[PDB]
Ligand binder design. Structure first.
Ligand SMILES: NC1=N[C@H]2[C@H](CO)N=C(N)N3CCC(O)(O)[C@]23N1
Length: 823
């Protein structure tokens, strides 16, 4: 296994070469490939000449475009603010679940708010070991007949971990820095070197605050406590011997980290434009680089083409003004050197490149036309900037080898983040740890929509789609065709986009390529986790059309299905809490009322034991024919095996089929509440349902009681939420207004229903909306968690344990990735 790293300079190649010799990672060999600039390395990775490089966030955006097709895979984790510990959040969510779902696991947290390594389930007496995230160590379950297990102690905090490393077996590491930790195990704001007498400030995760390093005998700056804001900040640094303010930058000499860098270009230019220091607003006034060329008299901006923007660079011959360390003024520490050597009056870089020392001739140039000390960058900056990242090809053929090497190299403490040859070679010198990013992350989700759009805005005039048009996302060709017919009559209110599946529609809406889509319940958790909201919902009640005639009216019964546990009146011995070992009948594996809801409740109350193992002998079409979930399944009256199959071949398949399994050979069936009324009172002419009576059956309540099949509203496993039309938060009002108007024309009572019908089509079934939809009802947003608000507390608890930590789609870790954005 090999990893070929692309270096952009002679100095970087020299550092990478040193790591080839010094860093011994078994199974994986590192190699270094020289190219002359950042862009030439990006092309080399696209072409397979190399596999990976570290990129500024600005270049991460540029590399994501079709010219290069690279994606970020590894980056240093950062924090926006202090958050609740995971255990305490889990405790709060589980305590906020539906109290009628009895016997649920409530985590046990310690005096620091973390998980006790031993976790136990009160109602079952089962205990197990967990990791720091409270996730069960599989295979450590112990039954109540045994003593609770012996579980390893929790992993130490970063400060205590590095304290024990610094000591390293010895009881005192003499002459070396030993971190000082508080009582929660986080870094004390003030840190001091036990031998040199120097002191400085750190944030809560131990990152040094620039401009606070203080030699002994001097007054140290005040160190802020509980600092969990670890995003990097773009800053403008100047010497205290000058006197101009930010608003007087016109005509000055400037040093920038680079033309493509976010801290050296995007952040200052963004502020120049918003403060109208630059006579520029759109691509009609030329390029941004030309406008900046008119603003400054002479600058060093590596990568620039304009002559005066390269005048101050000091690279030799072809190396001058190159995006490469061979240009001595390239990068954050090159821009600072350019100011230090008086080739510029101001340098544009980020806080992590500022001097550590408090005393000196440098200060910060704030955009509010004041100047402030180095350590006040959080209140004197040009914005938070995104993290930087290791990138590779979008195909990800080398992602695992790159991740494995860097993980092993960091474990062995290889010299990744420093070098005698120079600063910020291969990686930023400020970097302390590099971690894998979510597997589905791309530049959009890594940078965030705010910074992604801001970067795009400097390259093209982004025509923002109209708020009076709803771009509908379709998932197949017939839907696209019905949507094109809708657009033809809509007068421009409706347009169409094409995706392959509902999740890609969610992605399109997030990225501003579409505006709305109708989602099955099984996709709503991922949609809500990613930040979309229900705008309107499909109202399915055929008995009451009054909420559809008069909008906004009160709804007596939304009419969605209710999952129930159906048993016979004769079997008086069976209640909810003894279904273990009985004979269950499921419509099919994957059905929400017949499987997902029952399996969720069984898992919540029996330590995630398999619904396979929970019952005795069952019929659940979808399982393996050899399992006990198909023993009850009768294949086909016309024997071919078609047993336990997902077709009408299996006699026990579906709503009516699970009702068959109950009466024939079974004692409990998981079905919607409508199944018993549809197949009793002689409503089914078949011989098995020969005038079977509805009063012959009852439904099981979660409190151990029973009730007649008519009271499904108060004795159910869970009611399903309706299907929802989702959109972005800022677009809910427009989508609601446009859809309600379209419904007044082409709904079931539309004034123009002869021209188009929203809820039917000759092109197929359930296109765009379900064909049985009565109308769309605006979602009445309540002051609660959107998860509980949309799903209902019962469904939320039964299927998701009322938790925001489920991952039913790998898109969720990518779309919930936190960003370094500004207001
Ligand atoms: N806000 C809000 N309105 C309701 C309508 C259905 O009636 N839509 C939903 N999905 N819900 C689920 C729970 C609920 O309370 O019934 C509701 N929440």
């Amino acid at each position: 296994r090999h990893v070929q790293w692309c270096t952009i300079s002679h100095l970087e190649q020299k550092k990478c070469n040193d790591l080839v010799g010094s860093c011994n990672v078994p199974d994986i060999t590192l190699a270094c490939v020289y190219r002359s600039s950042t862009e030439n390395c990006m092309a080399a990775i696209k072409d397979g000449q190399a596999d990976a490089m570290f990129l500024d966030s600005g270049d991460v955006y540029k590399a994501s475009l079709d010219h290069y097709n690279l994606k970020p895979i590894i980056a240093e984790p950062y924090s926006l603010h202090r958050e609740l510990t995971k255990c305490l959040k889990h405790r709060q969510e589980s305590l906020g679940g539906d109290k009628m779902v009895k016997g649920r696991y409530i985590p046990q947290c310690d005096e620091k708010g973390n998980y006790h390594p031993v976790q136990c389930h009160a109602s079952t007496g089962y205990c197990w070991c967990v990791n720091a995230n409270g996730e069960k160590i599989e295979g450590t379950n112990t039954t109540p007949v045994q003593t609770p297990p012996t579980c390893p102690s929790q992993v130490l905090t970063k400060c205590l971990k590095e304290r024990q490393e610094a000591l390293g077996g010895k009881r005192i590491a003499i002459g070396r820095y030993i971190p000082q930790c508080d009582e929660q195990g986080n870094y004390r704001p003030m840190q001091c070197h036990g031998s040199t007498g120097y002191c400085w400030c750190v944030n809560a995760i131990g990152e040094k605050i620039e401009g606070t390093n203080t030699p002994p005998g001097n007054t140290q700056p005040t160190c802020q406590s509980h600092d969990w804001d670890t995003c990097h900040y773009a800053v403008a640094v100047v010497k205290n011997s000058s006197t101009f303010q930010f608003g007087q930058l016109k005509g000055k000499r400037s040093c920038h980290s680079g033309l493509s860098k976010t801290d050296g270009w995007n952040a200052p230019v963004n502020v120049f434009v918003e403060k109208k220091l630059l006579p520029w607003d759109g691509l009609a006034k030329g390029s941004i680089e030309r406008a900046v060329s008119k603003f400054f008299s002479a600058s060093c901006i590596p990568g620039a083409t304009e002559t005066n923007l390269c005048k101050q660079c000091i690279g030799e011959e072809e190396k001058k003004c190159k995006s490469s360390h061979d240009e001595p003024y390239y990068g954050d520490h090159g821009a600072f050197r350019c100011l230090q050597e008086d080739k510029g009056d101001v340098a544009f870089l980020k806080n992590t490149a500022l001097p550590d020392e408090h005393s000196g001739v440098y200060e910060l140039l704030c955009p509010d036309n004041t100047r402030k000390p180095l350590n006040k960058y959080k209140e004197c900056n040009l914005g938070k900037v995104p993290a930087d990242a290791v990138v590779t090809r979008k195909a990800g053929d080398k992602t695992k080898d790159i991740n494995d090497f860097l993980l092993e190299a960091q474990k062995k403490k290889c010299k990744l983040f420093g070098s005698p040859h120079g600063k910020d070679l291969m990686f930023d010198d400020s970097t302390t740890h590099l971690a894998p990013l979510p597997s589905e992350i791309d530049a959009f989700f890594f940078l965030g929509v705010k910074w992604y759009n801001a970067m795009k805005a400097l390259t093209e005039d982004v025509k923002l789609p109209s708020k009076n048009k709803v771009r509908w996302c379709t998932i197949n060709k017939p839907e696209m065709m019905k949507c094109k017919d809708w657009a033809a009559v809509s007068g421009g209110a409706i347009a169409c986009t094409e995706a392959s599946c509902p999740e890609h529609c969610v992605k399109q809406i997030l990225k501003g390529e579409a505006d709305a889509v109708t989602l099955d319940v099984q996709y709503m958790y991922m949609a809500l986790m990613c930040g979309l909201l229900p705008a309107v919902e499909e109202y399915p009640n055929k008995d009451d059309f009054h909420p559809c005639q008069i909008p906004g009216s009160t709804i007596k019964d939304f009419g969605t299905k209710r999952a129930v546990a159906l048993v016979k009146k004769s079997n008086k011995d069976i209640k909810w809490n003894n279904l273990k070992g009985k004979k269950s009948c499921h419509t099919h594996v994957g059905d929400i009322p017949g499987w997902v809801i029952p399996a969720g409740l069984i898992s919540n109350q029996n330590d995630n034991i398999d619904i396979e193992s929970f019952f005795g002998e069952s019929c659940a079409p979808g399982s393996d024919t050899n399992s006990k979930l198909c023993k009850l399944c009768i294949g086909d009256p016309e024997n071919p095996s078609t047993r336990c199959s997902l077709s009408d071949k299996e006699a026990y398949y579906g709503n009516e089929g699970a009702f068959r399994c109950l009466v024939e050979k079974g004692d409990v069936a998981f079905v919607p509440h409508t199944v018993v009324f549809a197949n009793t009172d002689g409503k089914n002419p078949a011989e098995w349902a020969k005038d079977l009576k509805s009063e012959d059956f009852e439904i099981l309540c979660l409190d151990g009681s029973r009730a007649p099949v008519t009271n499904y509203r108060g004795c159910n496993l869970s009611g399903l939420p309706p299907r929802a039309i989702v959109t972005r938060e800022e677009s809910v009002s427009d989508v609601v207004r446009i859809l309600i108007n379209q419904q007044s024309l082409y709904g079931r009572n539309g004034f123009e229903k002869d021209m188009f019908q929203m809820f039917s089509s000759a092109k197929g079934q359930n296109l765009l909306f379900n064909d049985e939809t009565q109308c769309l009802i605006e979602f009445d947003r309540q002051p609660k968690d959107i998860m509980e608000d949309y799903f209902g507390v019962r469904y939320y608890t039964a299927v998701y344990s009322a938790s925001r930590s489920a991952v039913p789609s790998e898109l969720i870790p990518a779309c919930t990735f936190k960003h370094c954005s500004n207001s």
